[PDB]
Homo-oligomer: 80 residues x 10
Amino acid sequence: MITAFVLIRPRGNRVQALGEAIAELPQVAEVYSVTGPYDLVALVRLKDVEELDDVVTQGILSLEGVERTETLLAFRAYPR
Amino acid sequence: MITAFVLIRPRGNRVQALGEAIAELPQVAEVYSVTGPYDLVALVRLKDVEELDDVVTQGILSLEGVERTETLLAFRAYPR
Amino acid sequence: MITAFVLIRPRGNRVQALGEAIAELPQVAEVYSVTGPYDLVALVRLKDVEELDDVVTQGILSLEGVERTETLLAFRAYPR
Amino acid sequence: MITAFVLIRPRGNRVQALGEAIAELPQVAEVYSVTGPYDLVALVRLKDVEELDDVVTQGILSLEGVERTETLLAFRAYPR
Amino acid sequence: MITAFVLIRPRGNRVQALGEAIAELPQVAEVYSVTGPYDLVALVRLKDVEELDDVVTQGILSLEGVERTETLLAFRAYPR
Amino acid sequence: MITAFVLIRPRGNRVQALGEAIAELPQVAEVYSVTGPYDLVALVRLKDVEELDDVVTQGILSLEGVERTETLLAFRAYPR
Amino acid sequence: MITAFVLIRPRGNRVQALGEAIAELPQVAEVYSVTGPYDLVALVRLKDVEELDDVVTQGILSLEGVERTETLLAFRAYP
Amino acid sequence: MITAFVLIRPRGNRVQALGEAIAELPQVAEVYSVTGPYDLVALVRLKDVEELDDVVTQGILSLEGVERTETLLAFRAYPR
Amino acid sequence: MITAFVLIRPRGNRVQALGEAIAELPQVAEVYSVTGPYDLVALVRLKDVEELDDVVTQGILSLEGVERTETLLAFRAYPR
Amino acid sequence: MITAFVLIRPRGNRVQALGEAIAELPQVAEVYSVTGPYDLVALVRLKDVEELDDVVTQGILSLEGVERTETLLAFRAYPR
Ligand SMILES: [Zn+2]
Ligand SMILES: [Zn+2]
Ligand SMILES: [Zn+2]
Ligand SMILES: [Zn+2]
């Protein structure tokens, strides 16, 4: 069941609201403020890859004050 | 509990072996091969941030074939 | 026939609008929403490199919300 | 049937060879020598997302002389 | 205490204003105008990781004129 | 006394070795393993600018394993 | 006679306008629209180095909607 | 005497004006329009490094049209 | 006729060798040593874009030292 | 006279030797160890631009342990 990490660069004074908003998106398992060149990361479980359309194109990129998105799509798991 | 996302660039031919190895380190909840500028991502759960010494400096950076590493430390969770 | 891969970075809330706009253009064979640094990627087929002025500068770049383009034109094919 | 564009930087001498070794991978529909920061592009057609491991990790990256790989995975198409 | 290095790129006319304001924050032990790509660096001391939210997201990023912030969080010290 | 922040990117297996060695140099007040693109940061205190040669060129860069250094030199402190 | 290649990033709609207004500069031997991180290239011909001010600062950068310019100046030829 | 090289990216239409403005600043021995990813370079002579406050923070960054600045502080001369 | 601008980054002590080596190739109309990130720039003149494999992949990339190429192919000329 | 600033990235343990060597080069007015992403800067006065062939291509790139160079050529002075 497909995993993705969405790296989100918001506007400084949007971080809290954008994090609270993104937590509500059905496919989003976890979301955090992180150190580094991106300010938020969303851990997202998809039933299919088309669902990045719903959670990123629509869920995330349609939110006011998001500047840049980068999706790291997991294609092989290493369990145990 | 402190979450981090460790982004890892191995030498090409070392992806699988490094993925399998990183999976066995205790603090490593999940690891995947991903699309993007990095090739693997480990999702890590820590009791203290110091444990990044154990998991990244020692655990990961001591493995041969790991060219670059970048840790996105989560400092705030957005649940619910 | 000359192939080109056109990478498009649209404004966030314009991804769907521009993907659909680009699919209309006669030279575009396929166009997708993709993971990575460019939200859209058009697979373009061309009579001659000259025609890329009509698809890129006229066709794509005239549209509102296109921040960046980057055309990867193909000069040698590997058949079978 | 998932589409992905694999961006490949090979060592300069290996280019015309590596392309011919890429073409003969099972999942590669089209493969080109291109202008830009990546020398080869592979148009891949996948059964699922997990089949990226077969075409990239255990495929493209296995081969001698491939320096970098970047996969742009298509999750939504735009018809017409 | 946890140590962090907060790298701040202000709008150019805001350097002094932002500098003096960051120095008022309880967690900031030292803050400087520096050479390099970030005009201000804050040396911060934290009770926990979570306190980074109070200093960066609520404290610095709430301020007028801050373009980018980048936190380097110290997980291990080397004494002597 | 001038302050500088020295950003050290070591070879991954050298992190601790270099950490401990940099801690020995008389001008280094604090040195840490950090998150980010540079594994080590040294907080240095200088008698004059020229003393940077002693710490960086003769001191850090004369050590086995250091890939890149970047010095952020503080020319103005903001008190309170 | 100094050669330089001026790399120009225009605003997306301005490309065809600027491209035609670049050619109309006294020093521009041939301006093209190209692939890559820069949309226009100006192959310039100079009497001396100071004449870059004429063709770039007072030339190209005086036109509406030029976002970035990068000049690669030729200092040696290989026959 | 402490030397620095200040690299200045102005707005296009401000280059000339800013070059003339920066020339009048006391500590500025020479200024030029240059080739490269920066447009102006001021060569600066300082009695103390604090003086970068006067010349850069105040002198330069307070001029309108200056988009990015970068200071290369010289900490060792090689005469003869 | 199709004009291309080829940018070459040779190994340092190979600049003169490759510049003179590039100048022989039949399609190369001009080649210079230049300021910037790429030491050499060939002005190439092609009959068909398929000829870039001759000039770049075998013609330029086969030679020792050439660390990186980037071809700016032209698709629209501006006359007068 | 034509002015140029040559930014030199040497190998860590080469800085001093390369700084001393570059200083004896006839066209080199001043050379310094500097802070930032480049380690040395050479301030160079030329009678003609071809002289970058003697100072840079030969004078500098021929020296062992120089990794990258970038020349910012001054084309207009702003005196006073
Ligand atoms: Zn959907
Ligand atoms: Zn530990
Ligand atoms: Zn002062
Ligand atoms: Zn000469």
